[PDB]
Design a protein around this nucleic acid. Structure first.
Ligand SMILES: [Mg+2]
Ligand SMILES: [Mg+2]
Ligand SMILES: [Mg+2]
Ligand SMILES: [Mg+2]
Ligand SMILES: [Mg+2]
Ligand SMILES: [Mg+2]
Ligand SMILES: [Mg+2]
Ligand SMILES: [Mg+2]
Ligand SMILES: [Mg+2]
Ligand SMILES: [Mg+2]
Ligand SMILES: [Mg+2]
Ligand SMILES: [Mg+2]
Ligand SMILES: [Mg+2]
Ligand SMILES: [Mg+2]
Ligand SMILES: [Mg+2]
Ligand SMILES: [Mg+2]
Ligand SMILES: [Mg+2]
Ligand SMILES: [Mg+2]
Ligand SMILES: [Mg+2]
Ligand SMILES: [Mg+2]
Ligand SMILES: [Mg+2]
Ligand SMILES: [Mg+2]
Lengths: 117, 177, 51, 136, 76
RNA sequence: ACUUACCAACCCGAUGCAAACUGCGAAUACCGGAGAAUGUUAUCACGGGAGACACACGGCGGGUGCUAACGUCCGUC
RNA sequence: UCCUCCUAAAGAGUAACGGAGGAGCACGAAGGUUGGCUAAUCCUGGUCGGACAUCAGGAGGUUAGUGCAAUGGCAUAAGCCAGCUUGACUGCGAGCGUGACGGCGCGAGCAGGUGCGAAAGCAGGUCAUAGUGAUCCGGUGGUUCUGAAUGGAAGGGCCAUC
RNA sequence: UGCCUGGCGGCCGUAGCGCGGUGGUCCCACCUGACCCCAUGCCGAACUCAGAAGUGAAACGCCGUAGCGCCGAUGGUAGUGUGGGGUCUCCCCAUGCGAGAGUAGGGAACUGCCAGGCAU
């Protein structure tokens, strides 16, 4: 299995469970250069809020978009953006990535900024 | 690391003009070097495996994985999960350091050496060879060896063909016919 | 057939016990497991003894 | 004499023999012998008929047998009462439905094939008829 | 050697069909494996019994890339 | 090491067979909702009284037997 | 006696000295959870090494695997590994299935307490379906019950277990 | 609004495979480095971290293409409920239902949310 098909397999179980639970998930996507965060509604097809390093307002304050400091910036931003829209309780979907390093920097910052999970 | 430099500084260049590749990312690369010992008779003397393992460890410079019987087969009287060999997968710095030791001094110390075969390619650019005696590696202390023992070498490549795989080794001055 | 009944006894003062089985050949030592003691209403260490 | 070399199971329900045949065209040879009636062909019958048609052509040309006796038939012997287990397998039949091409042939003149198939048909317990290859 | 044996029938099968209104907890199908899978408001027991987790109507569907069978429960 | 008019699995093309085969699949039957007409409640519950638990043939679908039996065993009328 | 398949007529059930097999156990991990992983078979190359051991690539795509019969499941694996572990928890249970009955099964949720996980969550044994013996009598431990004038005790009850 | 890309879903092969072509500013990918976080029953392959010298070779995406997969009528055929009938191991008639395979043919998916790059 190639890296990607392998990760999607790694992600399927947790997503079905969250789907079953009807949870609003904070979905993360990581790349060597960029990291992305999306709060998606239980229907699985609507993005309520989002943040990432490909948007200039965020990458502008960052040294390198593909590291842990950046991950902390993205996480903090989704949280804020999300809280301002009344969104508070979500579930973390690490999307087949280890709960670690960058993903965990993003998660920790998102919690820091009041997002509940 | 010296032979990784020689790959970059010298080999890439040679193969690009040899096969007229459009992208340098087509030039064949040594991907990994895998050493193996089919021990096989550790089933009677478990210690034969330990000494094979330690032979590889000292040859490769990294802890060997000991490989189990994938499948019982009554012909060699082996049950599934029986330890029956040991292996080491070399990459990066270690593979290159070994690759040189192999060419620069191990292989030359084969008895009445006349070169290695150039037809031992699998049909997709990967090369395989055996050594009969592990004492050709100077990491093995001739006085201490419990026993002379042999060893598989396979050089896995990103060449798609044997013609390409051969140019890659040839460019390192790999000894052939 | 060879598998014998044993009782795990509460390490608290209570005389509460769980009952289970054991292969005494392959596993000669004393089975020891945290379990819930309904008399002190807490999880406590339980230790094999004879049935 | 035809027989399955091995089978999953030794014995078989009686079952029934309704329907029209599959394999109703001459698909290999030039001529065919076709069942018009319904019934069971035993391995010995199939053999007797194969011999007859093969004498008739002096082992010239080529012959195909489209049927295969894969149904085991059991029987209870004399002086045994009912029950006490299903009988023992004694022989093998092919189930025949109207329309099955039984044998095919080619490499001989039509006149000789009709004769050979005539001799063979006299060995069979079901009425048959002579058929020919057809474009489409 | 000798035959002559069989086991008691286990009465597996669908207990409530499409459209049927059931109370939560009601067994909808007894099965040996997951021929049917648990969908929304339907649970899977240890013997792969599918049961209602909510009051409502039984609903069979076919879903996903493997064309699998799912039983769910619709509020009514 | 080389070869023989021998046998040859797998694979490709063509042709059939299966109660314990299915990449297909009815008619019916069965479960559930709603509605009219009809039907001496034909329904369910509790309670008083039982009898019965040797079945037969015929039709259809089958196992067994020989698609034998006024045979034998189930299903259904 | 029990389990699996067919007969069994596309819901359940359905007989014969009908056709085929299996159970009367195993496991403190082969249980729980988190995290990860992915077979068979064939072709080519490779010391000893052979049709078949272990190594590499390619085809293949679950035909493998599942402690064990068969059938149905299984990739989000139910298959395979490791870390931490004892939910193989105690009290209950809306609502159901299956039984003439005795019974047997499935079960979300509630209270207490626990393991694993960052968290959502998962765990009341094992992919599921065999692996079993009513009552009586008696043994062992526990006990706010009983205790033949009264206080005890014996014996009885109740709970656990043999 | 238009093209391009990434993410998350709907749908579950008319949607897949193959063959040919094609893309790197952006995105994606390979990639670079690895003491360290973290990892390998061996291996920085994978997981992971710090990056940006190189390349779209592979992968991925897009466009093309009926070798295959897939979908697929009409008509006939098979079966079958009810009623009737025959030469009753099997069939026929009336009525209703009506496959499977094959044939013609279709087919190189369709679609929503958010974000990024480019252009008018
Ligand atoms: Mg009554
Ligand atoms: Mg009686
Ligand atoms: Mg009777
Ligand atoms: Mg009767
Ligand atoms: Mg009679
Ligand atoms: Mg049935
Ligand atoms: Mg029926
Ligand atoms: Mg297991
Ligand atoms: Mg997991
Ligand atoms: Mg070989
Ligand atoms: Mg915790
Ligand atoms: Mg006493
Ligand atoms: Mg007294
Ligand atoms: Mg007294
Ligand atoms: Mg890398
Ligand atoms: Mg390319
Ligand atoms: Mg066309
Ligand atoms: Mg129609
Ligand atoms: Mg249809
Ligand atoms: Mg059709
Ligand atoms: Mg078709
Ligand atoms: Mg936009």
């Amino acid at each position: 299995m190639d890296k990607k098909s392998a990760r999607i397999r790694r992600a399927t179980r947790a997503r079905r469970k969250l789907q079953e639970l009807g949870a609003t998930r904070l979905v993360v996507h990581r790349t060597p250069r960029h990291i992305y965060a999306q709060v998606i509604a239980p229907n699985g097809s609507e993005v309520l809020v989002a943040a990432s390093t490909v948007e200039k307002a965020i990458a502008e304050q960052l040294k390198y978009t593909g590291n842990k400091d950046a991950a902390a910036a993205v996480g903090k931003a989704v949280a804020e953006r999300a809280l301002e829209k009344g969104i508070k309780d979500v579930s973390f979907d690490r999307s087949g990535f280890q709960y670690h390093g960058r993903v965990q920097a993003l998660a920790d910052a998102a919690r820091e900024a009041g997002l509940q999970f | 690391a010296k032979l990784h430099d020689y790959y970059k500084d010298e080999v890439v260049k040679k193969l690009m003009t040899e096969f007229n590749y459009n992208s340098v990312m087509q030039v064949p690369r040594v991907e990994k070097i895998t050493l193996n010992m089919g021990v096989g008779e550790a089933i009677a003397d478990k210690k034969l495996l330990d000494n094979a393992a330690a032979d590889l460890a000292a040859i490769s410079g990294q802890k060997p994985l000991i490989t189990k019987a994938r499948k019982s087969v009554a012909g060699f009287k082996i049950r599934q999960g029986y330890p029956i060999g040991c292996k080491v997968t070399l990459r990066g710095e270690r593979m290159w350091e070994f690759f040189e030791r192999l060419i620069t001094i191990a292989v030359p110390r084969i008895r009445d050496f006349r070169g290695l075969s150039a037809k031992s390619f699998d049909g997709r650019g990967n090369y395989s060879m055996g050594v009969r005696e592990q004492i050709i590696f100077p990491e093995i202390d001739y006085d201490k060896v419990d026993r002379v023992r042999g060893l598989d070498i396979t050089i896995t490549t990103t060449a798609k063909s044997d013609e390409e795989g051969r140019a890659l080794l040839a460019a390192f001055d790999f000894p052939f016919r | 057939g060879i598998r014998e009944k044993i009782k795990l006894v509460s390490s608290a003062g209570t005389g509460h016990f769980y009952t289970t089985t054991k292969n005494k050949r392959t596993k000669p030592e004393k089975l020891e497991l945290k379990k819930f003691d309904p008399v002190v209403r807490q999880h406590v260490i339980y230790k094999e003894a004879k049935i | 004499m035809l027989q399955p070399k091995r089978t999953k199971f030794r014995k078989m329900h009686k079952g029934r023999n309704r329907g029209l045949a599959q394999g109703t065209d001459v698909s290999f040879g030039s001529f065919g012998l076709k069942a018009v009636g319904r019934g069971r062909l035993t391995a010995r019958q199939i053999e007797a008929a194969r011999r007859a048609m093969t004498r008739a052509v002096k082992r010239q040309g080529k012959i195909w047998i489209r049927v295969f006796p894969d149904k085991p038939i059991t029987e209870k012997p004399l002086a045994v009462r009912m029950g006490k287990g299903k009988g023992n397998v004694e022989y093998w039949v092919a189930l025949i439905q109207p329309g099955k091409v039984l044998y095919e042939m080619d490499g001989v003149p039509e006149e000789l094939a009709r004769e050979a198939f005539k001799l063979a048909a006299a060995k069979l317990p079901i009425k048959t008829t002579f058929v020919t290859k057809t474009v489409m | 050697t000798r035959n002559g044996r069989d086991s008691e029938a286990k009465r597996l099968g669908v207990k409530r069909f499409g459209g049927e209104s059931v109370l939560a907890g009601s067994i909808i199908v007894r099965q040996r494996g997951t021929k049917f899978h648990a969908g929304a408001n339907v649970g899977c027991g240890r013997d792969h019994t599918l049961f209602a987790k909510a009051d409502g109507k039984v609903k069979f569907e076919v879903k996903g890339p493997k064309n699998r069978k799912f039983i769910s429960i619709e509020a009514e």
